[PDB]
């Protein structure tokens, strides 16, 4: 278990930590966050509570360093930083713990829900995606916007997400125009899993990493994004039949784990009815259409 | 963006544009088997190709043999469609190709957008406007040569005939369109209309008949008659 400790908490803020959050007050004795699960990936993130614009975070994992917190007056934001003295931080950490001064992670021992939301999610990846060479965690924003969005503008605050275009070159063969864009197999297995993803692992973590800032930040490039990785599933004829079942499990937890308040902006009526109801793939997400049934009958 | 009465002159103006109506691609008399089932059989079609300035039509002739042990074959014509219009373009020199095609029904749109990805420059436009190019089949030499192919073919016409050497462009395409909706509504009544006295002719490269500019004036008359008449014998009115 490790732990991500803050100076102070200046500015009354609503902390993010993966799915749970907790409120601290102006000024309040807070010192930071203990128990964190080894293993996974983590996003802790943050909602001023005077100025609801921007949810801003941090991806990191706390196998690579060891990070802390600390309110920028100047800026105006907590900042992840990372600490090089081990032992500083060591003999910080255990005060403060000492002092109780920390919330724990407050993962329940049945629960896998992180896990199976972050299974493919690799820090490496990620930082491929939020270019930002000299910290080991990256930082991400409700504002930033993706390459993809920006040639349709400042490229160091990109998400720089793999481009996906139902109608373009790389997604259609000359000479089989009508082929390739009824049934999109080529470009999901030729150009993007076999080119560009190498395994369908690294596709579902891109797809799994674009979710989560959608979640918590309310991305619109980023949702847009998981959602054009859902329906190039689901538009192919040919998919491996071990992709298939894992994406169920995906989109199961993804859905399961949206804010029921929220089903309005970040699900797209257009692809999940036809992902779930007319697409290739129509019959193969039983979990997910289930839940998506029982939880947003409105959408459908 | 859409092609509506409001940015009606731009198909006058002297940017290259087409006009792709696919109405008449797939055409199929619908039969009983004698099982009792129904079936279809297709005959001839066409891809009605025109560009609105100049008159010239590009009448792409399908025959019935590219649907042959070929399925959902209503989908195919519009990527066939798509696949020939593109071949067009790729045939014209540079300075010939459209900077936009306009096409008659938005069905056409992603097919014909995807044919043309190595043209990013030529703009795939709908319209609102409810062209009455379906009727193009009731033009007696237009129906005539689809019907007589026997293999693909390309076939090149003026769809105004010598109009432009009297009348505007604007002029013209409303004088086609007029003649074409009334054929449309009732085209028996259309045809006596055209085909009326013994001393007016069909040129034999001409597809409509030598009217003077008096002449013209009472049979566009006629024809806006007709075109009222039937909305009336429709509606009751
Ligand atoms: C409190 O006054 C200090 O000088 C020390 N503080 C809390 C830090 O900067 C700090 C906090 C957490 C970790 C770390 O590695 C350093």
């Keep these: ?300 | 963006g859409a092609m509506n009465s409001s940015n009606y002159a731009e198909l006058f103006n002297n940017d290259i544009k087409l006009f792709v109506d696919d109405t008449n691609v797939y055409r199929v008399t619908v039969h009983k088997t004698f099982e009792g089932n129904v079936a279809t059989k297709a005959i001839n079609g066409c891809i009605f190709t025109l560009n609105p300035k100049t008159g010239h039509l590009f009448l792409k002739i399908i025959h019935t043999s590219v649907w042959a042990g070929q399925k959902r074959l209503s989908q195919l014509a519009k990527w066939k469609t798509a696949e020939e219009v593109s071949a067009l373009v790729r045939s014209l020199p540079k300075e010939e190709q459209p900077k936009q095609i306009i096409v008659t029904r938005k069905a056409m749109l992603d097919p014909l957008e995807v044919h043309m990805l190595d043209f990013p420059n030529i703009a795939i436009r709908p319209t609102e406007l409810r062209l009455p190019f379906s009727a193009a089949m009731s033009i007696d030499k237009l129906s005539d040569v689809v019907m007589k192919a026997t293999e693909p073919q390309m076939v090149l016409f003026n769809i105004y005939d010598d109009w432009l050497d009297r009348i505007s462009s604007y002029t013209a395409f409303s004088r086609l369109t007029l003649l074409l909706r009334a054929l449309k509504t009732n085209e028996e009544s259309a045809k006596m209309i055209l085909l009326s006295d013994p001393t007016i002719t069909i040129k034999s490269y001409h597809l409509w008949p030598s009217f003077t500019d008096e002449q013209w004036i009472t049979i566009e008359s006629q024809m806006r008659d007709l075109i009222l008449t039937e909305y009336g014998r429709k509606y009751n009115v």
């Design chain 1, 1 to 300: 278990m490790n732990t991500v400790p803050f100076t102070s908490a200046p500015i009354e803020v609503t902390i993010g930590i993966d799915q749970y959050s907790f409120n601290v007050k102006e000024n309040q004795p807070f010192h930071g966050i203990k128990d964190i699960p080894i293993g996974h990936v983590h996003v802790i993130h943050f909602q001023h509570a005077d100025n609801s614009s921007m949810r801003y975070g941090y991806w990191f994992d706390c196998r690579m360093g060891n990070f802390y917190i600390q309110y920028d007056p100047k800026d105006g934001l907590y900042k992840m930083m990372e600490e090089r003295d081990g032992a500083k931080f060591e003999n910080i950490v255990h005060n403060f713990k000492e002092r109780q001064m920390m919330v724990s992670y407050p993962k329940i021992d049945e629960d896998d829900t992180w896990y199976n939301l972050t299974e493919f999610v690799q820090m490496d990846k990620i930082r491929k995606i939020v270019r930002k060479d000299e910290n080991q965690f990256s930082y991400v924003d409700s504002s930033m916007t993706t390459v993809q969005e920006n040639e349709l503008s400042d490229p160091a605050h990109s998400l720089n997400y793999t481009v996906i275009n139902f109608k373009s070159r790389e997604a259609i063969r000359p000479g089989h125009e009508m082929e390739d864009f009824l049934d999109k197999s080529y470009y999901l297995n030729t150009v993007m899993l076999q080119g560009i993803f190498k395994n369908s692992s690294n596709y579902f973590g891109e797809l799994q990493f674009a979710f989560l800032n959608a979640m918590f930040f309310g991305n619109y490039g980023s949702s847009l994004q998981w959602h054009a990785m859902i329906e190039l599933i689901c538009s192919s004829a040919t998919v491996p039949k071990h992709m298939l079942d894992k994406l169920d499990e995906i989109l199961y937890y993804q859905i399961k784990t949206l804010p029921e308040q929220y089903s309005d902006i970040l699900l797209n009526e257009r692809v999940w009815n036809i992902c779930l109801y007319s697409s290739f793939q129509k019959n193969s997400l039983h979990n997910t259409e289930k839940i998506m049934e029982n939880k947003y009958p409105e959408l459908l």
